[PDB]
């Protein structure tokens, strides 16, 4: 644990990137989190929503 100050910065940046990548898996209230599924399932008036 001698080099913990640099490893803390590395871990924080990697965890922020992992959270940003993980946020793509959330649908945020939509029917699906995948854009291609919505574009292949729905007409553009409701796929727009």
């Amino acid at each position: 644990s001698a080099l913990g100050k640099l490893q803390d910065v590395v871990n924080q940046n990697a965890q922020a990137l992992n959270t940003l990548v993980k946020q793509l898996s959330s649908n945020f209230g939509a029917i699906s989190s995948v854009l291609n599924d919505i574009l292949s399932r729905l007409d553009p008036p409701e796929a727009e929503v």
Partner: protein, 50 residues
């Protein structure tokens, strides 16, 4: 069937042409939920029940 004893049929292992159903003028009500009616031929389905 009657509505209290509604019949359920499994649809599986076949190719479904929904363009001859949706373009038919025989059906007064055609309401699709969660899928567009014109996108039906472009999708493949599992566990189809009628």
């Amino acid at each position: 069937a009657s509505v209290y004893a509604w019949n359920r049929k499994r649809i599986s292992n076949c190719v479904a042409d929904y363009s001859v159903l949706y373009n038919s003028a025989s059906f007064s009500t055609f309401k699709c939920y969660g899928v567009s009616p014109t996108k039906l031929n472009d999708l493949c389905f599992t566990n189809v029940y009628a």
